[PDB]
Design a binder for this molecule. Sequence first.
Ligand SMILES: NC(=O)C1=CN([C@@H]2O[C@H](COP(=O)(O)OP(=O)(O)OC[C@H]3O[C@@H](n4cnc5c(N)ncnc54)[C@H](OP(=O)(O)O)[C@@H]3O)[C@@H](O)[C@H]2O)C=CC1
Ligand SMILES: CCc1nc(N)nc(N)c1-c1ccc(Cl)cc1
Ligand SMILES: [Co+2]
Length: 159
Amino acid sequence: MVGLIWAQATSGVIGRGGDIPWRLPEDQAHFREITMGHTIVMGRRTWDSLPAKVRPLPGRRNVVLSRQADFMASGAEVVGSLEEALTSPETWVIGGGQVYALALPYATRCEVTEVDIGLPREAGDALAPVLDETWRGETGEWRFSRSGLRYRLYSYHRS
Ligand SMILES: NC(=O)C1=CN([C@@H]2O[C@H](COP(=O)(O)OP(=O)(O)OC[C@H]3O[C@@H](n4cnc5c(N)ncnc54)[C@H](OP(=O)(O)O)[C@@H]3O)[C@@H](O)[C@H]2O)C=CC1
Ligand SMILES: CCc1nc(N)nc(N)c1-c1ccc(Cl)cc1
Ligand SMILES: [Co+2]
């Protein structure tokens, strides 16, 4: 099982300037719950976005995708292809934009947090991948985050 998990603005933006233009503690808890214990695969830029004092993310096999043969990610595995990372029973691809696009053919689940923030797409933004007709989607109710933004959770599945 390979799943993708991301939070997006309604526009599809997931990242800007190498970081994220919101922070929802409820989304962080959801992300932690879904990925805990499992493999997490991230692009090198997403690894770079984590403060050194917080990485590797606890309780998970942290894997970083990079073209750099000597790139060192202390506390993680660095691999040069996504296929190398898929050896565990449950694998979550945790971003960013480039790696979601690369992982989508292997994926059967997408766990999406939609953040009700009006954020037009700008050049250089990382975006959520486009899900074609093979994906079945299940939507939760809109909720209020303590950060003031509404959010809702989608669960997309396909065989
Ligand atoms: N809202 C959310 O849920 C999430 C948001 N984000 C945001 O997304 C943004 C980062 O996403 P993005 O900029 O797309 O960068 P990625 O995190 O997708 O990492 C890109 C890097 O992955 C490596 N890579 C890409 N393609 C390949 C390949 N074919 N083979 C080997 N290695 C490859 C390269 O590493 P190298 O250059 O070392 O070769 C490349 O620079 C940030 O803003 C981050 O905050 C991140 C995760 C989730
Ligand atoms: C809590 C933010 C978040 N929410 C969701 N729904 N998915 C994610 N993949 C992330 C995320 C973004 C960047 C990093 Cl470094 C780790 C996780
Ligand atoms: Co689990």
